[PDB]
């Protein structure tokens, strides 16, 4: 079996096959040796339904994503109701195993949405709004809106 054989035995077992493939590739594609034998693999695997093999091979070759945009992750975390600490646990656990780190750490989520949250973009009005302050970078304010806290009054 040419699977567990050394390099140069598979070499001279398949010299004629690789010669025929290189000749055909030079005949039709200018000579790109790699892309032909890569699609040979494409179709050879997709014959038996193991589409999973084909995906991970198109995963390696100029892959889209080792990793995810940090926004997609922040979104993942908030949309799976993940505790911050649990997600961090997961991040450490999924990074230590086969991790090139994929998920972003937590502290990069915290500055990632400073764009998603309110009070960020600059804006204005004309004519200037009435009875509304013009400061535009005010984030989350508690709604009491200036309650004159002394006790004896309406509390």
CA-nearest of 94, 96, 92 to 106 is 92
| Burial class of residue 104 (count of CB atoms within 10 Å of its CB; 0-12, 13-18, 19+) | buried
**Residue 30 CA from chain centroid, whole number:** 35
Closer residue to a second copy in complex, CB, 61/141: 61
- By CB under 8 A, tell whether 32 contacts a second copy: yes
Residue 70 near residue 108 (C-beta atoms within 8 A): yes
Any contact of residue 36 with a second copy (CB under 8 A)?
yes
Query: Is residue 116 at the binding interface for a second copy, with CB under 8 A as the rule?
Result: no
Q: Are 54 and 46 in contact (CB under 8 A)?
A: yes
Choose the binding region for a second copy from 64-72, 118-126, 129-137, 139-147 (rule: CB under 8 A): 64-72
- 65 sits near a second copy (criterion: CB under 8 A): yes
**Which range in 1-9, 111-119, 122-130, 138-146 contacts a second copy by CB under 8 A?**
1-9
Q: Give whichever of 90 and 112 is closer to a second copy, judged by the CB atom.
A: 90
Quick one: 84 or 129, whose CB is closer to a second copy? 84
Whether cis (ω within 30° of 0) applies to the bond prior to 127 is yes
Q: For residues 57-91, b (16+ Cβ closer than 10 Å) or e, as one string? A: eeeeeeeeeeeeebeebbbebeeeeeeeeebbeeb
Q: Please tell me whether residue 132 binds a second copy under the rule CB under 8 A.
A: no
* Residue ranges in contact with a second copy by CB under 8 A: 1-3, 7, 10-11, 13-14, 16-18, 20-21, 24, 28-30, 32-46, 52-53, 55-57, 59-61, 63-69, 72, 75-76, 79-83, 86-87, 89-90, 92-94, 96-102
């Amino acid at each position: 079996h040419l699977l567990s054989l050394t390099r140069r035995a598979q070499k001279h077992r398949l010299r004629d096959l690789k010669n025929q493939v290189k000749t055909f590739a030079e005949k039709e594609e200018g000579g790109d040796v790699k892309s032909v034998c890569l699609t040979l693999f494409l179709l050879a695997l997709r014959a038996g339904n193991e589409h999973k093999q084909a995906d991970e091979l198109e995963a390696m070759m100029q892959g889209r994503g080792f990793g995810l945009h940090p926004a997609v992750c922040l979104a993942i975390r908030v949309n799976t109701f993940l505790s911050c600490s649990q997600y961090h646990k997961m991040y450490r656990t999924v990074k230590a195993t086969s991790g090139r780190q994929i998920f972003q750490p937590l502290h990069t989520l915290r500055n990632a949405e400073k764009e998603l949250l309110p009070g960020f973009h600059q804006f204005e009005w004309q004519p200037a709004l009435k009875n509304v302050s013009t400061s535009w970078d005010v984030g989350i304010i508690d709604g009491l809106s200036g309650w004159t806290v002394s006790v004896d009054d309406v509390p």
